[PDB]
Every structure is written in structure tokens, then in C-alpha cells.
Amino acid sequence: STIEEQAKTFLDKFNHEAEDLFYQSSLASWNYNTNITEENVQNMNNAGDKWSAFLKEQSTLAQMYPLQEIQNLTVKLQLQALQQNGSSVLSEDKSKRLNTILNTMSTIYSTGKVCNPDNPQECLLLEPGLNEIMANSLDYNERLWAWESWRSEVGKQLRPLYEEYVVLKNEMARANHYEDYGDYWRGDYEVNGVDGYDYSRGQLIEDVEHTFEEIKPLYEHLHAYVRAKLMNAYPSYISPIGCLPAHLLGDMWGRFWTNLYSLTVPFGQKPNIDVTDAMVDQAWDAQRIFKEAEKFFVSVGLPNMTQGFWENSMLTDPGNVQKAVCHPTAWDLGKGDFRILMCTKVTMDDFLTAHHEMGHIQYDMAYAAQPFLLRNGANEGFHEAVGEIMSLSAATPKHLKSIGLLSPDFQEDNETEINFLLKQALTIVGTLPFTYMLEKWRWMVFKGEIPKDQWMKKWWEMKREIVGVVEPVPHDETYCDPASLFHVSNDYSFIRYYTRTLYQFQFQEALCQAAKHEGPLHKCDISNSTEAGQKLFNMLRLGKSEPWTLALENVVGAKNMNVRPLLNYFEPLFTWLKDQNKNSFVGWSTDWSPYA
């Protein structure tokens, strides 16, 4: 006769309907992903349409129960997930316009190609053209040509579309009793209810600013070292004190700095660790790699793979008879169906990717007991962090020596550790400012502090002030540079990566401390340590049923984001950089530009 009982019954019905519908959709999607055939596409389309129709029908009936009359803090989260008007607040024509504009943007981004001047019959599409050039070329004019071209052909065909996209998304956000679309995305971290763990939507900005204010010295030293080393490959293109050009960062946009290892290696004479020859000399296969990964995961006390996973999940490419999409992915079809889809080769990179995917599968398997609506991570950053901690822990030389893939007489020196630390730093430390700046610019644009005619005047201005990169050619308001990315042209958030990177090192430090480890953090293996696994389990099985602050506190011991473990992980590299660059200058000035 109350409202709580009616809400409970409604969720009870929805829980049993959604399971069957979602399982049908997921099975159809997997069947399509295995092959490439017309009837599979037809089945996938039918299943997806049915699932979307059911979800839309069930969303409407959930608004009858007021949110203020229910005090349970568990069904309230599910109702809040269901009571959300998706895009129906506006009129039908506006919704149709929004769907059309999104589809047009996606189509424009997907099928964009650039042609070499005076050669209309030779056009490349980035994967083996621009981005390949971007990743494996030491020339100067070619890199600048590709970098300017791709943006010139793509961004101007997306900017007018993006203006209407922003306007309509703001309209929908205000219709949904929010401030803007940026507030709509920041709401993922919002926690209301139980006292002592509240997290307002506006606290995220302050937390991110405070945490980033501490990373600056290490990034400054790394930037100075990279700038000093790159003056040997481009002698007359890098300022002694200026900012690094964005077209010489080994990537189309500068997201990662991994492709600069061959230019900035400290000791090129001593080789790195590569067990590919050991893998080949003992006749290893994909099954052996996967069973070794399973052994590593069971070494810490976690459960192992279900029998069906060894049957329904493909491990190697079928060949020319079939046609699949080789892309690693952990599939949770529901109702006890967990699968891995990856084409495996005998290589160390696959040896680490297997661990990453199996960590994904373990995390998915952890929270199978929770209701359907709560079967996800605490936030949008826990999942990849749990995946990556195992990958970081499994590459230690001690583990390689223990499993017999390395010579027992290989005397590990204090010179290879610097190489490994630098290689890890170039791909971990060098991406946080980029993500932070992109999210800050997007939030400022959505909020309204930046008028429509002052977009790019800020976009290149923040770069020089944060990332230390300068545009090689001037730009006007016609360009839309951020839309060239996959996560900007298509509607996707970007603050996931910063939080994931900050969480992974904190978790690693907590586990290493719990494992009674003595020495530097970079030589830590969580193998043969039960105490290092059970603690992690306390976070694995919670899911979305509890605020992310409580989940983080259950492992690390602190309820707020922290950065000290990240700097502790790179301490000897920091000392070596401090010793090396005593005769150089740290810092950058925003006055030098390549074009002026």
C-alpha cells in the first residue's frame, strides 16, 4: 500500500525481463563478431532493435514513483538509472535532427581520406598512411604535411555540425534539470545520500586541479630531458627553452610518447628484455600462454576460468575460411557466459595483453551476484585500472626468471632498470596533461565561459600553458581541431583515463605494501601473496552498489584521489633525471612559436 513495495515489485519484474532480452542481444552480437555475413547483420539488427524498444517502453513506466518518497539507498540507485529521460524531453523533430547530426559526424569521421597533391590516384587513410607515417618517420616536412592535411580535410566538415550538436545537447541537459552537458557527464562521479562519503559534481574539478598541481615537477624534468635528447635528431627545429612541436611526438595528436624510445634511450649498447626467442625455442602456443596467465592469476588466490570459457571462446584466427575482427575483448554475455575474443601470436606483447584481458574477465566475474542494474564498475575508471595492474605486475624480471623464460645467470644491473622506467614513463606520465587539458577545454565550452567565436583562441592557448606543445601553423576559427579525435567526433567522455592512471599506481602501492615487499616499487611482484589478492577482492565484488569513495577506501585506506604513489613509483628515474640535466634549463616560455 506504500510506494517502496510497488517500486520493489517493479524492479523485480524488470530484473527478469532484462536478463533474457540482454542475453539474446549479446549472443547475436557475438555471432556477428565471429563471422562477417549478411544474415548475422540482420539478426544483430533485429535483436538490437527489440532490446532498444523494450528499454524505451520500460523507461516510461518508471516515472510514476516519486524519488523523494523512497528511503532505501539501494532501489533508489536503480530507479535513478531507470527514471532518466534519455533524449525524449525535446520534440520529435529535434530528436530526429540530433540523431541525424550524430550519424553525419560519425560517417564523416569514419570514411575520411587525404590525397597527395597533384596525384589524385594516390590517397591514404591514416592506418598505413598518415598514422603509420606519424609513427615511423624521421623526416620533418612529411610529418607536418600529414598533420596539417588530416585536420584540414576533416575538421572543417565537422565544426558546423558540432555547433548544432552542442546547442541541442545543452537544450536537452537543461530540460533534464541539469546545468549543462558537462555537468551531465560530471554526474557520473556524483554521490548523494549516506553521510561522510558525499561527492558533489563540482568537487571533481577542484580535486583534479589540486592533484595535477603536484605532478608538475616530474613532468617538467621529463619534458626537459626529452627536449634535450630530441635536439640530436632535429638539430635545427627545437628551441633550447621553447615548447615541443606537436608534429614530432610520434603520434597524430600526441596522446602517447611511446614511439620516441629509439631516440631517447640512455644506454643503447645494453639490450632490453625480450623473451620471444625463449618462447619460440620451447615450442609455445596460444594455449600455453593462456594457461600461464591462469596460473599467474591463481597464484594470488583468485578463482580460475569456467569450463565453457575453454570451449566457446576462440583463441586463434580461423584463417581464410572465415573472417573475424581481430581485436582483444572480454565478453560477459550474462547468465554465466564469459568469453575472450583475441587472435593470439607468440610475442611478449600478446603475453601481456592476455593478462590484461583475463583481469578484465576476473573483474567481470567478481560482481555476478549483484542485480542487473548494478553490474558495472564503481565508476568509469576502475575497470581498466584493475586490468592494467596485473599487466604491470607480470612483466617484472623476477617473475620471468621464476617461470623459466629467462636465463637464471642473467645478472640484472642498475642500468636496465633506468631503461625500463623511462619506457614506462614515456607512455604513462606523458598522457595525463593531454587528457586533463582536453577535458578542461570541453567543460569550459559546455559551461558557456567561452563564446562561440573564442574557441580556438583558448584551445591553442591552454596547450602552451599546460602540455608544453605549440602548433606549427596558425589556425583561425574555421578549424575544429579537437573533433579530429575519435572520442570528440563521436560522443564519448575523456576523464576516464586520468582517474584510471591515478588509481592503478595507488592500488599497486597498496598491494605491494600488503605483500611485505622490500625495495623499490618498480621491482614488485604480487605473485605468491594471498594477502595481496584478498584485499583486492573486497573491492571486486562491490560493483556499483556502494559509492566509489567507500570502495577506494576499502583497499588503499584513503577516500580521496592521491598522487604520491605515482611519484614514489618513479623515484630513481626522478633522481637520475635530476642528476643528468644539471647543465640544462627546466621550464618553457609561451612566446616562441615555430611560425613566428
Binding site: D12, K13, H16, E19, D20, G308, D337
Partner: protein, 99 residues
């Protein structure tokens, strides 16, 4: 294969219900589905590729007893061979002796 989900009461040992009337959840009187008026019957979705915890189990709950009765059809008894011209302990249909 179907199973009950909603009912406005609890069950008692050895009770069976076949009712198909719609279940009421609100104050207003009900005629047909639509609003808070759900059908109290939902089916399973068994598939051969489910996990161990979701695959169908044929469960004979031998909740058997009801022993007492004018009749007592019985479990089966073992018999052995027969020996003659010798001193043995015999049991014939409950008649027990020696000779």
C-alpha cells in the same frame, strides 16, 4: 517451463497453486494488465551454452514418505541359494528356525 514470481501471501508445506488471476499492487481496482497489475507467471530461457549456475537441472525432489498404509509394498530383499541334508539356520518369509 514456468515458475511463480508474485503472490500476496506465503506458502505452506505441500501446497500447490494453479491460479492465473492478475496480481494487484496498487489501491485502485484492476481489470487487465497495463499499470501496477502484473501477470504472476514467467517462463525460463534455458539454452545449451549457459553457465553451470544457469543450466537447467532436472531435480527429483524425492520428498517421499507416506510409509504407513493397510498395504506396505516393500523394498526388494536378497535371496541366497538353498542347502539340503545339512544343519542350517533358515528364514522363509519371516518363519525363522534351525534344522
Amino acid at each position: 517451463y514456468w515458475y511463480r514470481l508474485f503472490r500476496k501471501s506465503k506458502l505452506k508445506p505441500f501446497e500447490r497453486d494453479i491460479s492465473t488471476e492478475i496480481y494487484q499492487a496498487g489501491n485502485k481496482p484492476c481489470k487487465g494488465k497495463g499499470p501496477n497489475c502484473y501477470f504472476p507467471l514467467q517462463s525460463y530461457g534455458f539454452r545449451p551454452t549457459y553457465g553451470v549456475g544457469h543450466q537447467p537441472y532436472r531435480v527429483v525432489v524425492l520428498s517421499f514418505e507416506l510409509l504407513h498404509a493397510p498395504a506396505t509394498v516393500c523394498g526388494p530383499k536378497k535371496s541366497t541359494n538353498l542347502v539340503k541334508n545339512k544343519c542350517v539356520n533358515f528364514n522363509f518369509n519371516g518363519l525363522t528356525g534351525t534344522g
